[PDB]
Write a protein that binds this ligand. Structure first.
Ligand SMILES: CC(=O)N[C@H](CO)[C@H](O)c1ccc([N+](=O)[O-])cc1
Ligand SMILES: CC(=O)N[C@H](CO)[C@H](O)c1ccc([N+](=O)[O-])cc1
Ligand SMILES: CC(=O)N[C@H](CO)[C@H](O)c1ccc([N+](=O)[O-])cc1
Ligand SMILES: CC(=O)N[C@H](CO)[C@H](O)c1ccc([N+](=O)[O-])cc1
Lengths: 178, 178, 178, 178
């Protein structure tokens, strides 16, 4: 019953990061936050220049190779382990493989109580925010805005197009069983 | 006639930074962006621990001392100089002294063509965004949300409460004379 | 035999971070890097303002509470899990509890092949570097420079006082069994 | 007589940034620090993708175009203006044009009291540090390590190859006339 792991899925600039920081402030018990971005951070810089690594096409694309997935997996098993170890875990990801991505997670998650959250946002709005940000390579937002959700089943959906983060956070927190 | 300097004024988390990055992308000619934050950056770290420096009360407050103003001024004269040197300058500030702050600028600006922009945002919304951000000390948003505009005359106002940055940017760009 | 996890221990500004990035570039197989800093990052911002959390005394001190340790532990079990999952893991830590800290790790590590590395540096030199950095609160370097190693047994020691990071990296890489 | 502006010149990873932060802490009067990097920051992101802008060849190269120089100049006149306005200004640059770069500065500086500082460092050592850093594109260090100084006349030289930043700072501070 007790929610042991929250998994957020949404394209870039859909507002995931903000929701996470908000959820952390909201939720009474300490929740650790990890993600694909923090994984990239943990991975050697060359992984971004390697073959089976990950590359960011200048058009805003993103392609993941086996070398990257290999690591990505053991990492997943690791986060799950922290949860089973008793740590509350928040994870914002980007299901490039849509449904496929969610299955991958499911196999690692096992019978662990997980709250599946979908973070949507108008591609155009996202793209616009992508600019105001300056952080990412123009293109990713529009590219992931939809495909990522394609086929994924959530327990809670939030659209940051017209809802503030703190708000989306509140909607999510409301589904977290203590 | 030609707009030589854009000055943005708005409380923390009102969305200034984003607007700036957007304006830069929008406007055809290169615009250099500078601000109170980038000034803090240029100032020695101790300025934040000095007397006549600047201190961030844990309640989200902010107080500026003469040492800080002293520098702040020569800095202002400097940005103005870059403009007169022919560089298009964007400046997002936070008029803690409200009207007083705008006068200070006016004296440095001289007869230089300046577009005064006000960036407003619902204090609560801002405060909420302040959380999603994680960057600033909880409190500043709500504290500056209004006072800063008190008595300031703008050429263009934008409220990021329900308008995206790219949008506010567009509204602003529309007043920039080439 | 095969080295599955590298654990670095050294006071702040002793040069750990740099060594890590270097090791990652050097070592042929991809090594994931995690640490106390990245943990702080994953922890909710309030953990830094909470009771049993972690607080940075203005004199450069640092004290960890049970709430923090609680998380810290499950996190540890998690990193170990990633290793057993097959991911090569690098971990730069700061054994505030000296020997005590190493035992804590040992219990999580189990019979996992681990390379214990000590990163030393002249307190004064460190303190000086602490300034050039601007990142940390003046004081931590000098405070941890020695205590942290007190009682800890390593497999390899490196002193960044007169040795470059890339160099220390090389010395370390040389003890990593493939 | 009174030193009104300190200009540092050295290739990437030669240790400039650190020296600056150190000098700021050392020197009694507040010194504002600006640089080519902070300029890049102030320039629109597209300037990095524009023609007469600036581009970072993947081999670690760097080429500046007229559009970039155009801005770069007015910016220079601006920093000089801040100095004449009474602000003490520190500037760490990278004279890609070697001697040519110093002349450019000289014309803007005028008869302003300036302390010319050269920051040297063994190319290899720099390259190594470039790795430990993770910040820059592998290649720049080795490429600029020497050319930049070629033909430039300094008032003080410091080699961070075997000298800490705080140290180099001290050597520099010693030439600053109050
Ligand atoms: C570091 C960065 O900019 N990452 C963004 C997402 O934040 C990129 O769209 C991305 C998407 C999916 C991904 N993945 O799932 O492997 C890796 C990067
Ligand atoms: C660095 C930081 O967090 N600055 C925020 C604004 O961004 C703070 O509210 C602030 C407001 C006004 C100011 N000032 O005008 O001197 C300095 C800091
Ligand atoms: C975030 C930061 O500045 N951390 C530095 C180390 O990098 C601090 O000395 C520290 C040391 C030990 C620690 N711990 O082990 O819990 C946490 C922070
Ligand atoms: C942003 C960055 O990585 N800049 C480094 C220097 O720090 C690069 O070598 C560089 C050198 C000279 C330069 N310039 O002088 O125009 C611009 C960038």
């Amino acid at each position: 019953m007790t929610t042991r792991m929250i998994i957020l899925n949404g394209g870039s600039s859909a507002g995931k990061s903000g929701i996470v920081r908000c959820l952390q402030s909201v939720l009474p018990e300490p929740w650790l936050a990890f993600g694909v971005d923090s994984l990239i951070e943990a991975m050697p810089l060359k992984m971004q220049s390697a073959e089976g690594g990950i590359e960011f096409d200048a058009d805003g694309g993103v392609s993941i190779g086996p070398e990257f997935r290999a690591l990505e997996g053991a990492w997943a098993e690791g986060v799950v382990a922290m949860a089973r170890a008793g740590a509350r875990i928040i994870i914002d990801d980007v299901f490039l493989g849509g449904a496929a991505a969610q299955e991958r997670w499911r196999s690692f998650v096992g019978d662990l109580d997980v709250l599946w959250v979908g973070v949507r946002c108008d591609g155009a709005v996202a793209e616009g925010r992508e600019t105001a940000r300056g952080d990412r390579v123009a293109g990713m937002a529009a590219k992931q805005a939809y495909v990522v959700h394609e086929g994924v089943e959530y327990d809670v959906e939030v659209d940051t197009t017209h809802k503030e983060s703190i708000e989306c956070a509140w909607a999510i927190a409301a589904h977290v069983v203590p």
